[PDB]
Amino acid sequence: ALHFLDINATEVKKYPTAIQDIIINRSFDGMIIRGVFPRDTMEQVARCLEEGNDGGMKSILNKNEEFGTKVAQIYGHAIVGQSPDLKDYFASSAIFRQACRTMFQGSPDFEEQVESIFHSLSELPVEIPTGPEGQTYTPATIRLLLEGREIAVHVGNDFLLMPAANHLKTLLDLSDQLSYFIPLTVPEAGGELVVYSLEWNPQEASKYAQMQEYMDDVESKIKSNQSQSVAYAPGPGDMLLFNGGRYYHRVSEVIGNSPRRTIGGFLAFSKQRNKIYYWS
Amino acid sequence: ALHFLDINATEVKKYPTAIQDIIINRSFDGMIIRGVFPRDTMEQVARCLEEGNDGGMKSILNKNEEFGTKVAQIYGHAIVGQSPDLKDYFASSAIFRQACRTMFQGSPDFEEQVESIFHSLSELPVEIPTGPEGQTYTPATIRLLLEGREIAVHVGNDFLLMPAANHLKTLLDLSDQLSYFIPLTVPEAGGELVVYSLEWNPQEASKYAQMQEYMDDVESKIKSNQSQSVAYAPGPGDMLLFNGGRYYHRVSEVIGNSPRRTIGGFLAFSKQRNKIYYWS
């Protein structure tokens, strides 16, 4: 995958076509924007969580008990895997927006930082979606991978077929959706983003029990031997931004004591490609 | 290879046994210390070079058109591969030290920063080697990889068999030597450190033309269907520290316009293992 930019956050202005290029033109596949947040910012935010001085965010922590101890714990309600009503999603999302502003102590505030990055890369306005009759979506979600845990293979564009999506399908240009995330703490080893070469293909994916078996099965029947995969491990405060709507991806198993705290969501164009919408 | 720590530079204090461990105990193979330098420092240093406002360092740049256009250009003379006199090495090394101190505007000074990091990791004293007749070795070297170029496969401990080494072998405990480097600028793609599992020794290394096709053997050497490799790409200000004395390694071909500027050298114990020596 030509998932390549590894850009200094500073020179982000040099790519005012970058989002349009990944989604629509598909000329490249993702970016690594280095230093979107100060490593200091990330360590104090990551410390708030670890103790409890967190603007009230322990109160939306959804350790995912009965999915086994092999998928990620997660602060705030992730819109993926929600009842199509969105009762509790719109609810936790307000808590998240507030508890987050607190923790970042405006040095620099999470939401505005991310917005200017997305702004500079698209040159369109950036908004978090307003719900049907005024609720707020959440701009992002903090994922917690404890040692041993991992996030399994999945694709962005399956969300377009999910009933919870039904509101946003009315707001969004139904292009590819992008993923983005910024690490608060990194693990000692592993726990790296792995993007597969293979594109969005629901028809053939569904015929497998667990979707990793689809990735494996492909990697046998394709035996050229380039590699089908490419893996990154962005450090604290480095943003990773990519066409996760299109490409199958995952996170490696976390090695060693220290967990992988990591905040982010998704990102896409809107109906008539005017605003840039970013949610989770 | 358990080339694994990915530590935040801040908590470098928690590992005061770390260097002895990589070299002497071989209990693990390397570290990535995140944020040894402020991203801000790294880009202004990189701007100084790129412009010319460089404390006079342009006068020791060695573009190596002597070797075809696939090896790195390099500021200051790297001690590896010099006539045993070290005349032109000791000279350029004096220029390096001043121009380098200059460029960092003591915010924070290169020699001082790196020294405290190596200190915290050993709790031994850290010194730059003084030459036979009072000269100075250079503490490091700025390597410049232009688009298309690369660094070929090699091992640190071959230096121990080299003529230019003859001085230091009197100064060093002849254990493993470590490599270390800090990226000033990162490329768009590629140009990543790849460390191979294959260890240092003198025998069948001698039997070739030379050495990337020692990563001939390397792969149909092994396999079950292992990894002979591990690959890293540290961002601006992130230090990479590893037992490159022991394991064969290289740097990927740099892809894309912007070049891979990178400052660093090597690192080892001293005759009766008290102070820690670091040079380039």
Added chain:
Amino acid sequence: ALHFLDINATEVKKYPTAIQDIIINRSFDGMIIRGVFPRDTMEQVARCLEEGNDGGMKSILNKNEEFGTKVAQIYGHAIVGQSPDLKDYFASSAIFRQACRTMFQGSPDFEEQVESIFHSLSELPVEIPTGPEGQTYTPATIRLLLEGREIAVHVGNDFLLMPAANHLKTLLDLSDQLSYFIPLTVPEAGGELVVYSLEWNPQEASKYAQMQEYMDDVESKIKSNQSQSVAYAPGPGDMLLFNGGRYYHRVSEVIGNSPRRTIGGFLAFSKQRNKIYYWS
């Protein structure tokens, strides 16, 4: 010339107006400061050179066989007669500053010593010029006159019309510049500083091919019966400091085996006469 003080370096404090006096008021013409350096220091420094234990200085020795065996060899690059770039000047100056500190083993360090003398004589601060893009100028230069050789007539203030001067002219008050030098070894005979009574006169000097013929030609057309000259021969560690910017001068042919080794440079005021600048 009232080139007269022959002061014991000790009582140098008694003349805190001295530099302002020679340069600006021109109330007297120069000093001989006896014992700025220990005779022990001068013999051990000169022995480091003579052998090779020189902190790496042999590598900036510029024998000038390109000019006939009529002018002096010289360690380090003298700023006079340089391309206006100062690329190789600034480079050697870095080397010089290092090898010099080394050789003096801080007993007492060259730069520190010299600075305190210049300090006491002006009561202004003393600095070595930092260059346009962060380089260092050389605080001094070691001159080597072998037996038979000599230094030809010249004036300090021509440097003001030289293109290599273009940087410092922005830094200096464009007063007269003074010379200073301290003998490491003295020759058996000859090799003495000869300062002529004649003042700086570029227009009329330029009409001569060899500038000595200007000194001769004047000394015929003037014949009163005083003397036009005054000549000195300071022993090891004796500093000679005088207005060589204003007056024509030279060094006699060296007689006898032992060469005339001598370290020194020039000395001047700064733009708005605060700081004292000294270089070579």
Added chain:
Amino acid sequence: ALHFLDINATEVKKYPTAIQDIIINRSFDGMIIRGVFPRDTMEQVARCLEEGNDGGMKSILNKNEEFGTKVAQIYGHAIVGQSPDLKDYFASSAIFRQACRTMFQGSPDFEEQVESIFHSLSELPVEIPTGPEGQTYTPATIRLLLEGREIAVHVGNDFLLMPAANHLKTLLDLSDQLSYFIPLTVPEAGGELVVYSLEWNPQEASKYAQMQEYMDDVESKIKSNQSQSVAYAPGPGDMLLFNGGRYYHRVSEVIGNSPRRTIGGFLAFSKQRNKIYYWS
């Protein structure tokens, strides 16, 4: 005059024939031995005088004029121009020896230093003459030139025709006598030794009233135009040693406030050239 050595006191050992050479072979004319005494010693000795903490030497100071303000004040009796009895000479000579040993505080003792120097230069024993009836001669004499004063022209070898000499003529090999002196303090300008090229010539000297009009008168009658003279100015602790017995010589008029304090005497071979005698 080949009055040339300007040797470092250290390497005085390299010339074990030098005294025999100046006196007997007349192969050269004199030496300047740099650093016989520490500048530190010289100024603390000079401070003792200037104050009064002088081991009692004020009691042999002969402010001298009886003779017009033409010649120098002088501590102790100089043997030249004495009653042939030597009663008052031998008496002041005892005083001088004690106050002098005193003032030097054995750091290094005057007699002992000078003796080792004369020793290294002859490889003969060195002694101060014991008088006829057990008295001592003085090893040296401290001369004091105040501002404006000077020493008139003279030759060493007239002393041989003087009645005050009659004793030593039984002691000395009647070769040439050398003069020697070491400055304790130097004046601001002038007050330098001038040795003329002209040799010892009593018959023709005696015909002039003032011995300078013999020097002027000669320098007119064979007007070629090299120079007939040579002039020296040794700093504190530098010894000047030369065949002043043979050549007419003098001291410049002292310029400026600070006087020219200076200790020294003469030096010659002994009857059957074994021992080296030195007195004043």
